[PDB]
Amino acid sequence: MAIIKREWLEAATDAHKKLGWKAKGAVVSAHDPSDTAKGYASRHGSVVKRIAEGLLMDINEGADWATSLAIEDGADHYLWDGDGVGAGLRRQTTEAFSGKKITATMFKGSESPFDEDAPYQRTIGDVFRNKRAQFYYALADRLYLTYRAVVHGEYADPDDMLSFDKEAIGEKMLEKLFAELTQIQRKFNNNGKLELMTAVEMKQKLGIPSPNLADALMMCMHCP
Ligand SMILES: [Mn+2]
Ligand SMILES: [Mn+2]
């Protein structure tokens, strides 16, 4: 039921070095303010460069922490989870980015998918229940393609892959991320759409704590 294989994550570690390409594109950062530990993720194009945990912070301290990291990382775009306790953080977030060319986007995972009437590559809306499922599968698809390139020698466009810059991220935090990603699970859906267990469900059913590093990385798959 899990959507991401550990072997893909191991392959994707330093995949850009293994395959000889460089990060190109926008810098995208995202923040998970927790249900009520926090998460932050940042990538430059297809290369993930920071995974950070935000400990012993209230909601406003967490947002200061995450927005400061976004500034430090040279973000072009910043997203944060607004489905729960984060729903009120827009003012603080825009204040943090005053005078800086950084866009701020509230991510709501429970929304219908982005661009849902577009064809699925029938429509995106037929395939994914919501944005949480859509962007976790964007992540899973990038990782699988990266695995096939790294381990099976199957060409893929770097723009469609994802590499973890291990030296930038740090081994400990990369391991924490990976331990969360392999816990993200599909759940039954009565309309035949892809849908994932929520944190609440993961906690109650399986005793799994909130995967906020994973969620932060998932949100940064959406470049607004
Ligand atoms: Mn969240
Ligand atoms: Mn979360």
UniProtKB/TrEMBL annotation:
Mg(2+) 2 binds at D32, D35, D81. Mn(2+) 1 binds at D32, D81. It comes from the Viruses. Ca(2+) binds at D32, D81, D215. Mn(2+) 2 binds at D32, N212. Mn(2+) 3 binds at D32, N212, D215. Mg(2+) 3 binds at D32, D35, D215. This is Gene 2 protein. It comes from Shigella phage Sf6. The gene is 2.
